[PDB]
Amino acid sequence: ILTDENYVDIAEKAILKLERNTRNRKNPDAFFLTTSKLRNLLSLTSTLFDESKVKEYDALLDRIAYLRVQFVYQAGREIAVKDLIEKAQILEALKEIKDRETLQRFCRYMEALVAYFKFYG
Amino acid sequence: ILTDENYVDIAEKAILKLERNTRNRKNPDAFFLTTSKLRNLLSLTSTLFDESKVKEYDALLDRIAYLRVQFVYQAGREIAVKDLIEKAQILEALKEIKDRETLQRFCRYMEALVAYFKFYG
Amino acid sequence: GLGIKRLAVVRLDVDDLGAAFMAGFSQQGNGQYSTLSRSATFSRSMSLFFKVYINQFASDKKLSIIYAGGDDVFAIGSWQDIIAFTVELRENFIKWTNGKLTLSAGIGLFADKTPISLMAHQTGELEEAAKGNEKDSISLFSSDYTFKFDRFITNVYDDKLEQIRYFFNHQDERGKNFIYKLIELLRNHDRMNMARLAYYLTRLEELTRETDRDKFKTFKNLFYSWYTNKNDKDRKEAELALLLYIYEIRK
Amino acid sequence: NDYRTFKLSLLTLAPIHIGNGEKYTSREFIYENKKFYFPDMGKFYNKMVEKRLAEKFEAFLIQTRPNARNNRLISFLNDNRIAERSFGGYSISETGLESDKNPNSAGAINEVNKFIRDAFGNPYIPGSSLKGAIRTILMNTTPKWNNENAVNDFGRFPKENKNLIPWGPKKGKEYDDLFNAIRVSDSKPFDNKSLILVQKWDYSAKTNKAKPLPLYRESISPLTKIEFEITTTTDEAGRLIEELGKRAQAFYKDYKAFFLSEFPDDKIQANLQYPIYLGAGSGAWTKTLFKQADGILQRRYSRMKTKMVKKGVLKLTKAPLKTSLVKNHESFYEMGKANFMIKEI
Amino acid sequence: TFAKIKFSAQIRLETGLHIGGSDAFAAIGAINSPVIKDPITNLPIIPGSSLKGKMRTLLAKVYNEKVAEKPSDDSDILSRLFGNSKDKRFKMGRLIFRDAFLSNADELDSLGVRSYTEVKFENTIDRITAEANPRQIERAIRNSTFDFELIYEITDENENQVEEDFKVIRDGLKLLELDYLGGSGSRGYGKVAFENLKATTVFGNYDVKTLNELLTA
RNA sequence: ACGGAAACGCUUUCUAGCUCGCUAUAAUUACCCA
RNA sequence: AAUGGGUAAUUAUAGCGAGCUAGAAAGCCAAAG
Numbered sequence A, B: 001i002l003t004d005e006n007y008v009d010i011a012e013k014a015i016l017k018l019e020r021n022t023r024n025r026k027n028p029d030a031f032f033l034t035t036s037k038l039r040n041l042l043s044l045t046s047t048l049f050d051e052s053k054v055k056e057y058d059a060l061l062d063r064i065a066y067l068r069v070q071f072v073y074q075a076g077r078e079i080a081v082k083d084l085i086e087k088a089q090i091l092e093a094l095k096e097i098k099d100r101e102t103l104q105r106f107c108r109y110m111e112a113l114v115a116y117f118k119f120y121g
Numbered sequence C: 001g002l003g004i005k006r007l008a009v010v011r012l013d014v015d016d017l018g019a020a021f022m023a024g025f026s027q028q029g030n031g032q033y034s035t036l037s038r039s040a041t042f043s044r045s046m047s048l049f050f051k052v053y054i055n056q057f058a059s060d061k062k063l064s065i066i067y068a069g070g071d072d073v074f075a076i077g078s079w080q081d082i083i084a085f086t087v088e089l090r091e092n093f094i095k096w097t098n099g100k101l102t103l104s105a106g107i108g109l110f111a112d113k114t115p116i117s118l119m120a121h122q123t124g125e126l127e128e129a130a131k132g133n134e135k136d137s138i139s140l141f142s143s144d145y146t147f148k149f150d151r152f153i154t155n156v157y158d159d160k161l162e163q164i165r166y167f168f169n170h171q172d173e174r175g176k177n178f179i180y181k182l183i184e185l186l187r188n189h190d191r192m193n194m195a196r197l198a199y200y201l202t203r204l205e206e207l208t209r210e211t212d213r214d215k216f217k218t219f220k221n222l223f224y225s226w227y228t229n230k231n232d233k234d235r236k237e238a239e240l241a242l243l244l245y246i247y248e249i250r251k
Numbered sequence D: 001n002d003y004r005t006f007k008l009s010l011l012t013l014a015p016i017h018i019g020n021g022e023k024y025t026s027r028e029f030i031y032e033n034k035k036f037y038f039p040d041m042g043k044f045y046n047k048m049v050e051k052r053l054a055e056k057f058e059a060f061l062i063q064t065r066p067n068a069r070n071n072r073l074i075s076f077l078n079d080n081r082i083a084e085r086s087f088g089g090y091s092i093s094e095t096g097l098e099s100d101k102n103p104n105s106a107g108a109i110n111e112v113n114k115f116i117r118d119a120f121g122n123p124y125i126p127g128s129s130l131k132g133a134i135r136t137i138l139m140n141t142t143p144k145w146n147n148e149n150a151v152n153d154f155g156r157f158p159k160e161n162k163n164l165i166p167w168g169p170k171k172g173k174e175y176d177d178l179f180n181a182i183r184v185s186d187s188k189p190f191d192n193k194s195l196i197l198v199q200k201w202d203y204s205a206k207t208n209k210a211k212p213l214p215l216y217r218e219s220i221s222p223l224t225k226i227e228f229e230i231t232t233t234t235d236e237a238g239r240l241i242e243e244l245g246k247r248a249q250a251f252y253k254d255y256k257a258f259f260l261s262e263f264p265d266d267k268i269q270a271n272l273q274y275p276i277y278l279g280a281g282s283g284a285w286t287k288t289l290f291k292q293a294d295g296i297l298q299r300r301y302s303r304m305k306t307k308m309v310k311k312g313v314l315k316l317t318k319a320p321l322k323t324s325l326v327k328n329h330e331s332f333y334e335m336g337k338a339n340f341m342i343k344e345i
Numbered sequence E: 001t002f003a004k005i006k007f008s009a010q011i012r013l014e015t016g017l018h019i020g021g022s023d024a025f026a027a028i029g030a031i032n033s034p035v036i037k038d039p040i041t042n043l044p045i046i047p048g049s050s051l052k053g054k055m056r057t058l059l060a061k062v063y064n065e066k067v068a069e070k071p072s073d074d075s076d077i078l079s080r081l082f083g084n085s086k087d088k089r090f091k092m093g094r095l096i097f098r099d100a101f102l103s104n105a106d107e108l109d110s111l112g113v114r115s116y117t118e119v120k121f122e123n124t125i126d127r128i129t130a131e132a133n134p135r136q137i138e139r140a141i142r143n144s145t146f147d148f149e150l151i152y153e154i155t156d157e158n159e160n161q162v163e164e165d166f167k168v169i170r171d172g173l174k175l176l177e178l179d180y181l182g183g184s185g186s187r188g189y190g191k192v193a194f195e196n197l198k199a200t201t202v203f204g205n206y207d208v209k210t211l212n213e214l215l216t217a
Numbered sequence F: 001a002c003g004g005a006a007a008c009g010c011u012u013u014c015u016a017g018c019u020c021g022c023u024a025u026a027a028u029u030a031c032c033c034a
Numbered sequence G: 001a002a003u004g005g006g007u008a009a010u011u012a013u014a015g016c017g018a019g020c021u022a023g024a025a026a027g028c029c030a031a032a033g
């Protein structure tokens, strides 16, 4: 679960907990995870974040159902993304959305993850 | 930390601590930081300073949490905004809001930064 | 037709005249100048001034001396010719007394068609509110605009007011909206309005045309300089100067 | 009334892809007839959760199975006997040339890029994309716009000056803005039957092969007439948008002598009208000032996928034969090589 | 005498338009240029200021003989239909350009519309180094129509200024169909049609038989 | 047998007039990995 | 060689951030007495 007073901090300590290149000592402290595979995760929720303001949640939630499978499939391809969705409890927070103010907190939490990943690296 | 007696003076002495363009003599001592990478950050706090006058602080904690995301993200993109919000301790001023009064103090601090950015160069 | 349609009332008083008459001459010498002849000539000097020369000072001006004598001058009239009257009266009285014998007036503005006791009492309250500034003060129009005359006639009425008039007549872009927004930033004035003023004048520096831009730069580096002066005897003067310049150009 | 309107007509010789940003993944289509069916996967998961098999679906999505015809969500529906396919999105017919392997590999395409579509759902060409094709023809064929458009010794040879072409409000000056005066309209929204999804085929110099790529963008079919309206409110703009006929020929002449030479001429099309390179797959040299980016374009690549020496790999595709446009065998088009003809109205 | 008439129209979009919004609390990878929209229905509006300042400037390049160089230098055919700030008799300006709200939301819902505004991705190709810069700007969709109110005053200063100002208002509307209501314009985004021009009197007595014929010019 | 008795700081008055969220900007590049 | 797949970068940049006009009048009162 992530709420308003802590989700940015949860994202901050998530990004610090992703593992790095232990080898490859050419500009070290570099993540396995990259900017492209993380913006592919933010692009899943970037449509639903601005469809949430206009539409009702009850006429929208099948996309929120399918977006769990989207995060699963984007996790099941690279080990640097399956690592991310378990460090930051993304799959655990997708099940606990259930309204608009947590949809616009999860879609905002992904923005926090991208922001701290861009900030570190 | 910023108090009610010194938040304008820190924004004065933080524009003066931000390093300028030493080289490229075409109107020299211009800032690396551009105006429109700074009016975007003020564009958040101005629309919190106008909502804090009406709405209670327990309804604005969705936007106040996202200021912490946007300053981090805009600093992660360009090094000049990083040099801003590390010189002017904005991420350590966002840590302390907690009510309407310190929120409006920070939102005036973000404006005093822009006023002294406009006044110098 | 430019000028606000108000009339002013001034009430004056030479500060500490009985002290300047009894003791008076006792400081120079060793009590050797404290005669009856010195006090008699002093009475003739003060009587000569306040009963002969005030009519000389009120010659061209549009006013009425309702009383003059002793050390009081109570005078109603037009407000340009009341402020000019009292600046002229003191700048002649301190030449008359070599800079001894401070006088301290209260000017009050009043609209037309207002009763004369409701007018004179509010003038006399400004006069006694200028007695207790330190001693020597003019109290323009209100309880707060209370300036020493040496801090008023030089700074406000001749230095700042002529600089403001000189800037605001040799241009066309800036108008009375700019003067009103300066009066607000001068009257409220926390530390935040120093930054807001530094932003406002820098916005308007790069909005004026390139013909008149050093003209505006030598005005904003002159207004921001006294706004942020940290002596408090330079910001309060500018508000009274801008009040007088708005009162001069009222339609 | 200096609104001099024109009427551009655009004939696609090569397949043209534009836009939309998004892209369907590997398990988001159905190839069971000779068409590709792209559903609304939200309605797919909604109507499939009645089948009580969403956990087996989630098993299928992370199934690292070989034999790629069994990975592409066709075999999931054929094995588990889901046969309704009444879902949202749309269908497009095949190119026929996508799977190079005649051994089965049918519908074994992997990741298609979507085409730009309005909210009705119909494809069109946006005017902002056609204006970027006009603007490079105008930039390269004007010698005053090619000299200092460069670094000025700032960073990593970084960027265009963006100020050679005099643009701005420019406080104190009059209002020029040449490309505000060149007003390009969006096209009429054409039909879904013009889209084929060509793959990608990178054809190198100094190693004569045509290695294909896993990037199969949903392009327009060749020989599709698409109309555009351009109004020029400045007479200075009217001169350039009238002289586009000379300038596109001059751009293609300076670009063939720079880049299409060192490639074999059989894979290179002929113009047949005035040439234009509409976006997504024409190469970098059609999107840039090509005679000013010779030591500056390749500097960005110190990675696994670098430009080879200089003047990077050619971008061919495989769409079927029409008219003939191809000039060779094996159907190598040029992916963005379109043509136009203009007339004032 | 006093009269007050009304111009009904339909602003049918043709390659629909962007009129830029306000929020800084947008996103990271979503719409950074919002369209203006109604704050309760979240339906796009055409605000009357963007109609007015396009008609005020497009007719300025037609009816001002001397080039304006400033507003309230207009040539008194525009100064009275829009209003100066500086002429003593032309402070108000006898036209009320009301805002326009999306009428045919059910007709767009009959078509396959996912959402009432589309999002358009528009990177800026750096003409050297070929790198990009994506913007995701929002625009109201193509076959949207907007109810266009327009209210005109007829006081005892209109001796023969009534029918003269209607070879001006419809002139400005047929010049809006050659220009673009703000947005980009040079990138599409503006072409409008004005449908069912229907003048009527909402107050007073005026004969719009002779007015409803030059609407159909 | 209260310097007191009686007495609305009251009436009239649009925060108003003017003003395009606008300007430039191909969702594009690279061709490869096991 | 086939067979499996895509991977990396950009997520808006530069601006304007409000300008000008009005800043209380007219009555009662006071004046006219």
Ligand SMILES: Nc1ncnc2c1ncn2[C@@H]1O[C@H](COP(=O)(O)OP(=O)(O)NP(=O)(O)O)[C@@H](O)[C@H]1O
Binding pocket: C013, C014, C015, C016, C017, C018, C019, C021, C042, C043, C044, C046, C047, C070, C071, C131
């Ligand atoms: N020429 C004069 N010679 C002597 N006494 C005079 C003269 N003119 C006026 N006075 C009297 O001097 C006294 C001064 O009165 P007043 O001005 O009230 O006191 P003051 O000394 O001025 N202290 P302040 O009222 O605070 O200025 C009055 O009684 C006047 O009548």
Ligand SMILES: [Mg+2]
Binding pocket: C013, C014, C015, C016, C017, C071
């Ligand atoms: Mg005295």
Ligand SMILES: [Mg+2]
Binding pocket: C012, C013, C014, C071, C072
């Ligand atoms: Mg006295």
